[model samples]
Target: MDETGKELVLALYDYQEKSPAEVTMKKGDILTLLNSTNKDWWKVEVNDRQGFVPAAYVKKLD
Candidate 1:
């Protein structure tokens, strides 16, 4: 678990980034959801890197 109550999850779609501080992830990549205060963007960690990704692009594990 992360600092936030939000749980870790997996990407539901492939996301490619064009800039820094933006995360690129594959459909099955594991991520720690840091914050979900924003509807459009959620802070997450992937492979030890921290960044923001579209909230719609990931799904919570069962």
Candidate 2:
């Protein structure tokens, strides 16, 4: 089946970005998955912000 890749997730916590390449989320936002590697510090973009966060920082949409 043909479909869109990189599913969307929910921001679970306020992850502060201490680095220039990290994403800082406000704890309640929609996050878009960015890659298939599924790294512990996976990639996500929210409200135009982009970068990495712990895998637990985001969760599946309800």
Candidate 3:
């Protein structure tokens, strides 16, 4: 079987990249999951902003 990939949006923590280090997604924020290791890393795009996220906290939506 072929494993096709899909895109999903996740909630951001308020402390991300800040004091607490969490994701703070805003109203217009759009995080695109480019690729994931399905282990401990995920490539995403947040409103043109790109970075890697730990899969443990990122929620995937269909």
Question: How high a TM-score does candidate 2 get?
Answer: 0.75
Candidate 3 vs. true structure, TM-score: 0.55
For model 2, the run of ten residues with the poorest summed lDDT? 1-10
TM-score per candidate, in order? 0.79, 0.75, 0.55
Question: Model 2, which residues run further than 4 Å from truth?
Answer: 1-5
Could you tell me which residue pairs clash in candidate 2? none
Count of steric clashes across candidates, in order: 0, 0, 5
lDDT, candidate 2, 1-62, per-residue tens: 22233577788888888996788887778877774366677787766766788887788773
For candidate 1, write residues 1-62 as lDDT tens digits.
44564578789999886567678888898788887777888888887667888889989773
Question: Alpha carbon lDDT of residue 38, candidate 1?
Answer: 77
- Candidate No. with top lDDT: 1
Give me the overall lDDT of model 2: 0.74
What overall lDDT goes with each candidate model? Answer: 0.79, 0.74, 0.54
Better of 2 and 3 by TM-score: 2
RMSD of 1: 2.0
